[PDB]
Design an enzyme around this catalytic site. Structure first.
Site, PDB file in Angstrom:
ATOM      1  N   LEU A  29     -10.601   5.635  -4.443  1.00 59.92           N
ATOM      2  CA  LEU A  29     -10.000   4.997  -3.275  1.00 59.92           C
ATOM      3  C   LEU A  29     -10.518   3.588  -3.048  1.00 59.92           C
ATOM      4  O   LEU A  29     -11.675   3.406  -2.687  1.00 59.92           O
ATOM      5  CB  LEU A  29     -10.268   5.838  -2.031  1.00 59.92           C
ATOM      6  CG  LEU A  29      -9.698   5.297  -0.718  1.00 59.92           C
ATOM      7  CD1 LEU A  29      -8.176   5.326  -0.738  1.00 59.92           C
ATOM      8  CD2 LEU A  29     -10.209   6.139   0.421  1.00 59.92           C
ATOM      9  N   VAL A  71      -5.114  -3.307   1.031  1.00 60.39           N
ATOM     10  CA  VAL A  71      -5.752  -3.505   2.316  1.00 60.39           C
ATOM     11  C   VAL A  71      -4.720  -3.436   3.426  1.00 60.39           C
ATOM     12  O   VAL A  71      -3.682  -4.087   3.375  1.00 60.39           O
ATOM     13  CB  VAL A  71      -6.587  -4.856   2.382  1.00 60.39           C
ATOM     14  CG1 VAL A  71      -6.446  -5.635   1.099  1.00 60.39           C
ATOM     15  CG2 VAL A  71      -6.177  -5.693   3.580  1.00 60.39           C
ATOM     16  N   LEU A  72      -5.014  -2.600   4.415  1.00 58.90           N
ATOM     17  CA  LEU A  72      -4.158  -2.417   5.574  1.00 58.90           C
ATOM     18  C   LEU A  72      -4.884  -2.994   6.779  1.00 58.90           C
ATOM     19  O   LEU A  72      -6.069  -2.721   6.982  1.00 58.90           O
ATOM     20  CB  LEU A  72      -3.876  -0.928   5.787  1.00 58.90           C
ATOM     21  CG  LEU A  72      -2.935  -0.290   4.764  1.00 58.90           C
ATOM     22  CD1 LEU A  72      -3.048   1.220   4.799  1.00 58.90           C
ATOM     23  CD2 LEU A  72      -1.517  -0.737   5.059  1.00 58.90           C
ATOM     24  N   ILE A  73      -4.174  -3.796   7.568  1.00 63.06           N
ATOM     25  CA  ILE A  73      -4.753  -4.407   8.758  1.00 63.06           C
ATOM     26  C   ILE A  73      -4.034  -3.950  10.031  1.00 63.06           C
ATOM     27  O   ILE A  73      -2.807  -3.999  10.101  1.00 63.06           O
ATOM     28  CB  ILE A  73      -4.671  -5.935   8.669  1.00 63.06           C
ATOM     29  CG1 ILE A  73      -5.379  -6.412   7.400  1.00 63.06           C
ATOM     30  CG2 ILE A  73      -5.283  -6.555   9.909  1.00 63.06           C
ATOM     31  CD1 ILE A  73      -5.373  -7.920   7.208  1.00 63.06           C
ATOM     32  N   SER A  76       0.359  -4.795  15.754  1.00 63.74           N
ATOM     33  CA  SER A  76       0.763  -4.518  17.122  1.00 63.74           C
ATOM     34  C   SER A  76       1.333  -3.139  17.340  1.00 63.74           C
ATOM     35  O   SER A  76       1.242  -2.606  18.443  1.00 63.74           O
ATOM     36  CB  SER A  76       1.787  -5.534  17.593  1.00 63.74           C
ATOM     37  OG  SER A  76       1.254  -6.840  17.493  1.00 63.74           O
ATOM     38  N   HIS A  78       2.224   1.468  13.236  1.00 68.09           N
ATOM     39  CA  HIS A  78       2.423   1.447  11.797  1.00 68.09           C
ATOM     40  C   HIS A  78       1.128   1.644  11.020  1.00 68.09           C
ATOM     41  O   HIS A  78       1.029   2.525  10.174  1.00 68.09           O
ATOM     42  CB  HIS A  78       3.043   0.119  11.390  1.00 68.09           C
ATOM     43  CG  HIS A  78       3.330   0.004   9.922  1.00 68.09           C
ATOM     44  ND1 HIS A  78       4.378   0.662   9.311  1.00 68.09           N
ATOM     45  CD2 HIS A  78       2.705  -0.700   8.947  1.00 68.09           C
ATOM     46  CE1 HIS A  78       4.385   0.365   8.023  1.00 68.09           C
ATOM     47  NE2 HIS A  78       3.380  -0.459   7.776  1.00 68.09           N
ATOM     48  N   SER A 115       0.779  -1.236   0.000  1.00 66.07           N
ATOM     49  CA  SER A 115       0.000   0.000   0.000  1.00 66.07           C
ATOM     50  C   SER A 115       0.813   1.289   0.000  1.00 66.07           C
ATOM     51  O   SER A 115       0.381   2.295  -0.564  1.00 66.07           O
ATOM     52  CB  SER A 115      -0.956   0.012   1.190  1.00 66.07           C
ATOM     53  OG  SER A 115      -1.926  -1.010   1.056  1.00 66.07           O
TER      54      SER A 115
HETATM   55  C1  LIG Z   1     -16.402   0.426   3.283  1.00 63.20           C
HETATM   56  C2  LIG Z   1     -16.887   1.765   2.707  1.00 63.20           C
HETATM   57  C3  LIG Z   1     -17.704   2.652   3.433  1.00 63.20           C
HETATM   58  C4  LIG Z   1     -18.063   3.882   2.735  1.00 63.20           C
HETATM   59  N1  LIG Z   1     -18.879   4.797   3.452  1.00 63.20           N
HETATM   60  C5  LIG Z   1     -19.229   5.939   2.864  1.00 63.20           C
HETATM   61  C6  LIG Z   1     -20.103   6.930   3.634  1.00 63.20           C
HETATM   62  O1  LIG Z   1     -20.518   6.773   4.762  1.00 63.20           O
HETATM   63  N2  LIG Z   1     -20.394   8.095   2.900  1.00 63.20           N
HETATM   64  C7  LIG Z   1     -20.013   8.436   1.634  1.00 63.20           C
HETATM   65  O2  LIG Z   1     -20.284   9.448   1.042  1.00 63.20           O
HETATM   66  N3  LIG Z   1     -19.223   7.499   0.971  1.00 63.20           N
HETATM   67  C8  LIG Z   1     -18.828   6.294   1.527  1.00 63.20           C
HETATM   68  N4  LIG Z   1     -18.048   5.437   0.804  1.00 63.20           N
HETATM   69  C9  LIG Z   1     -17.550   5.632  -0.577  1.00 63.20           C
HETATM   70  C10 LIG Z   1     -16.321   6.561  -0.562  1.00 63.20           C
HETATM   71  O3  LIG Z   1     -16.765   7.929  -0.305  1.00 63.20           O
HETATM   72  C11 LIG Z   1     -15.693   6.713  -1.892  1.00 63.20           C
HETATM   73  O4  LIG Z   1     -16.651   7.171  -2.855  1.00 63.20           O
HETATM   74  C12 LIG Z   1     -15.077   5.440  -2.424  1.00 63.20           C
HETATM   75  O5  LIG Z   1     -14.085   4.769  -1.637  1.00 63.20           O
HETATM   76  C13 LIG Z   1     -14.519   5.862  -3.840  1.00 63.20           C
HETATM   77  O6  LIG Z   1     -15.557   5.594  -4.801  1.00 63.20           O
HETATM   78  C14 LIG Z   1     -17.621   4.164   1.401  1.00 63.20           C
HETATM   79  C15 LIG Z   1     -16.781   3.254   0.643  1.00 63.20           C
HETATM   80  C16 LIG Z   1     -16.452   2.106   1.331  1.00 63.20           C
HETATM   81  C17 LIG Z   1     -15.532   1.109   0.546  1.00 63.20           C
HETATM   82  C1  LIG Z   2       5.620  -3.890  10.019  1.00 61.40           C
HETATM   83  C2  LIG Z   2       4.908  -3.736   8.667  1.00 61.40           C
HETATM   84  C3  LIG Z   2       3.536  -4.002   8.492  1.00 61.40           C
HETATM   85  C4  LIG Z   2       3.030  -3.793   7.140  1.00 61.40           C
HETATM   86  N1  LIG Z   2       1.647  -4.044   6.940  1.00 61.40           N
HETATM   87  C5  LIG Z   2       1.136  -3.863   5.726  1.00 61.40           C
HETATM   88  C6  LIG Z   2      -0.353  -4.125   5.504  1.00 61.40           C
HETATM   89  O1  LIG Z   2      -1.132  -4.491   6.348  1.00 61.40           O
HETATM   90  N2  LIG Z   2      -0.762  -3.892   4.179  1.00 61.40           N
HETATM   91  C7  LIG Z   2      -0.023  -3.480   3.106  1.00 61.40           C
HETATM   92  O2  LIG Z   2      -0.413  -3.291   1.983  1.00 61.40           O
HETATM   93  N3  LIG Z   2       1.329  -3.257   3.354  1.00 61.40           N
HETATM   94  C8  LIG Z   2       1.920  -3.428   4.595  1.00 61.40           C
HETATM   95  N4  LIG Z   2       3.254  -3.182   4.749  1.00 61.40           N
HETATM   96  C9  LIG Z   2       4.209  -2.742   3.706  1.00 61.40           C
HETATM   97  C10 LIG Z   2       4.072  -1.227   3.476  1.00 61.40           C
HETATM   98  O3  LIG Z   2       2.833  -0.967   2.745  1.00 61.40           O
HETATM   99  C11 LIG Z   2       5.070  -0.690   2.530  1.00 61.40           C
HETATM  100  O4  LIG Z   2       5.011  -1.389   1.281  1.00 61.40           O
HETATM  101  C12 LIG Z   2       6.486  -0.773   3.035  1.00 61.40           C
HETATM  102  O5  LIG Z   2       6.810  -0.152   4.287  1.00 61.40           O
HETATM  103  C13 LIG Z   2       7.340  -0.185   1.839  1.00 61.40           C
HETATM  104  O6  LIG Z   2       7.740  -1.297   1.012  1.00 61.40           O
HETATM  105  C14 LIG Z   2       3.875  -3.355   6.066  1.00 61.40           C
HETATM  106  C15 LIG Z   2       5.288  -3.083   6.240  1.00 61.40           C
HETATM  107  C16 LIG Z   2       5.733  -3.280   7.527  1.00 61.40           C
HETATM  108  C17 LIG Z   2       7.253  -2.977   7.752  1.00 61.40           C
END
Ligand SMILES: Cc1cc2nc3c(=O)[nH]c(=O)nc-3n(C[C@H](O)[C@H](O)[C@H](O)CO)c2cc1C
Ligand SMILES: Cc1cc2nc3c(=O)[nH]c(=O)nc-3n(C[C@H](O)[C@H](O)[C@H](O)CO)c2cc1C
Ligand SMILES: Cc1cc2nc3c(=O)[nH]c(=O)nc-3n(C[C@H](O)[C@H](O)[C@H](O)CO)c2cc1C
Ligand SMILES: Cc1cc2nc3c(=O)[nH]c(=O)nc-3n(C[C@H](O)[C@H](O)[C@H](O)CO)c2cc1C
Ligand SMILES: Cc1cc2nc3c(=O)[nH]c(=O)nc-3n(C[C@H](O)[C@H](O)[C@H](O)CO)c2cc1C
Lengths: 146, 146, 146, 146, 146
Positions: free
Chosen positions: E107, E74-76, E79, E82, E50
């Site tokens: 997004l 996707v970011l999770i 601990s 980060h 990401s």
């Molecule tokens: C999990 C999720 C929840 C979202 N909740 C909202 C919200 O409460 N209001 C809103 O205008 N857009 C919401 N959006 C859409 C967001 O504003 C944006 O349009 C998208 O991520 C790009 O199309 C949500 C999108 C996602 C994936």
């Molecule tokens: C400790 C740690 C946790 C990370 N967790 C994520 C994650 O949940 N999702 C993701 O896309 N990248 C994750 N990344 C990588 C991060 O997006 C990024 O690519 C690096 O820091 C640059 O290569 C993580 C990197 C580190 C060092």
């Protein structure tokens, strides 16, 4: 304050149309009926969601010329951290588009905990419609910009 | 520190006029009576709310020339996350307008939990008026900019 | 590391002069006595508070030429949210001024919960003076910039 | 993925050298042994601390030409709010330097609660060395930039 | 809404491929089958994680021409802190790339507490695939940009 010559733009998202319509209505109603804004001088675009608000506005600002613009959308806290990060980015973004262009951008973004709080701020269930306030703010900022 | 030649701008929002007036008063009073700023050399504009503070200032800075500007407004924590996001955006925005223009922008934004905290910082109920401090800061930054 | 030719700027706020003086002292002392910086090559300006730190520095950077600059100030958590928003804006702003100008800006901003924490980091009550570290950092970044 | 012609920059801070060395090692090791990066084509600069990471990189990017750069540093939560504000500013800053220059900047910044968490992510005590991952990311982003 | 002529870009990270594939699939599927986007008119690049999303997109936008782009990752929560800092920087960065280029950036970043929340939003275990929504948003923003 009257702005018969003012051209105003309104970009709104589409999620939560139940809270959004009242918001837009109040904004338009207020400008027409209290500040003499002409209906033909009010463009109303829309985007999928709040995230597209800053870009939707930036694009339109590049096409035509407006004296003020109102960004309307409602974000509701969900199960993930999504709400928090999008809210911050969108608010910061509307602020940027306004400062970059020199065109006043009124914040019509609601960042609430639940649907009820949004409807309440849209004038329903005994609440005050904030769209009215945004309408007057648009008019005022538009005039001071001239 | 005296600034008889200094031209100063004061843009303030209108919500919470009870806390805002004392704030503006203290700022003006202090500049006139302690730094010899001339009343005619102090412009006082206003905007609907704190969100319009950055743009209100940017617009004015483009029209006339000032040595310093003070942005005054008060934000109070409410039921939604609105307070948090607007506060951050407005503060970041005033900082930007100042750095972009080269004109000193003094932060006169109160971000409180309740009305009492605001009034207290406006000099009421035994508190110290922060407008005075902002007035002296404006004068000082104005001079150092010359 | 020695920088006999380095010209260094130090802008510091005035609130909490009790913690600030030790901080500035350590910075100067360290540069002179450990890196051979010449006393005449060290300018020391001041501003009312931490909010003016970014602009105070930006203004000076425009006037004269420096190899490095140190922004010093201390923010203490209070009753309102003020502490949080100003801290974030000021830190972000010093970072910006540095990247915009190409001139190294060393962060000498303390963001503490109480006065004790600040004094401790100023070398008092058994603590280590962080001003010393900032002094060496300025010298080092100044040289690497040449 | 092999990058025999890639020129890569590595700027690392000096605090917590115990966690930092393993991190740098893994990055270099991985690039050489898995992506055929030439040791002579890897510059390794250093700065006092994480705050100087963005500027240290920006300066170097202006001097020589690199295909990718890795910013390495470790921030540990302390008693004050320092950790929170610096972390945010530094991360935002590295992102900015990358987008401004067009040069890929890989984030090798650890923002942990304690020393143990850092060492664990540096490959010690049964953990996985994240420097390896950053090394491969640098190589990959470098190639896609050509 | 149909976009037979639209050229769309999709950059996705590689961590959590289990949640990412469904996301990309839904986006593509939806554009082809509901908005008449031509498969040949959809480029799909990828980056390690990401953090590289903003730069990966910026690089591609410089090479070819697209009407809209989707950033997926996707970011999770882990601990350390980060998760929090990267999430904020990446979201702010995608917003910036979009506003800087004039190209709509949708997004498609999930910032969740655990793997389950991500899979749920990818259409699995009874959840709704958000990739579909992003696909329609891309198409819509692409057209409004013409
Ligand atoms: C999990 C999720 C929840 C979202 N909740 C909202 C919200 O409460 N209001 C809103 O205008 N857009 C919401 N959006 C859409 C967001 O504003 C944006 O349009 C998208 O991520 C790009 O199309 C949500 C999108 C996602 C994936
Ligand atoms: C400790 C740690 C946790 C990370 N967790 C994520 C994650 O949940 N999702 C993701 O896309 N990248 C994750 N990344 C990588 C991060 O997006 C990024 O690519 C690096 O820091 C640059 O290569 C993580 C990197 C580190 C060092
Ligand atoms: C729900 C809500 C609460 C608001 N609270 C404040 C406040 O406490 N102080 C202030 O100056 N403006 C406040 N405003 C107005 C805001 O600064 C801004 O002017 C508008 O969003 C744009 O006109 C509020 C607006 C809304 C919709
Ligand atoms: C309520 C309040 C608390 C303040 N606390 C501090 C502080 O702890 N440290 C500091 O340098 N400045 C402080 N300042 C001043 C601030 O940095 C800034 O200079 C002004 O808002 C602009 O003059 C404070 C100002 C106010 C109104
Ligand atoms: C109180 C304090 C704690 C610091 N903690 C760290 C840290 O954990 N990691 C790091 O790289 N730098 C740290 N630094 C130094 C910081 O990154 C930066 O280099 C200085 O503020 C500018 O020289 C700290 C500085 C101070 C004053």
């Amino acid at each position: 304050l009257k702005g018969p010559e003012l051209r105003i733009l309104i970009v709104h998202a589409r999620y939560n149309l139940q809270a959004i319509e009242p918001l837009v209505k109040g904004a338009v109603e207020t400008m027409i009926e209290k500040h003499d804004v002409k209906l033909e001088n009010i463009d109303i675009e829309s985007v999928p969601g709040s995230w597209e608000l800053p870009q939707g506005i930036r694009a339109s600002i590049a096409r035509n010329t407006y004296d003020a613009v109102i960004g309307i959308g409602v974000l509701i806290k969900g199960s993930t951290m999504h709400f928090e990060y999008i809210s911050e980015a969108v608010v910061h973004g509307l602020m940027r588009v306004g400062l970059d262009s020199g065109v006043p951008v009124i914040l019509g973004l609601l960042t609430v905990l639940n649907e009820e709080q949004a409807l309440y701020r849209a004038g329903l269930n005994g609440g005050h419609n904030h769209g009215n306030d945004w309408g007057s703010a648009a008019v005022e900022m538009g005039l001071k910009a001239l």
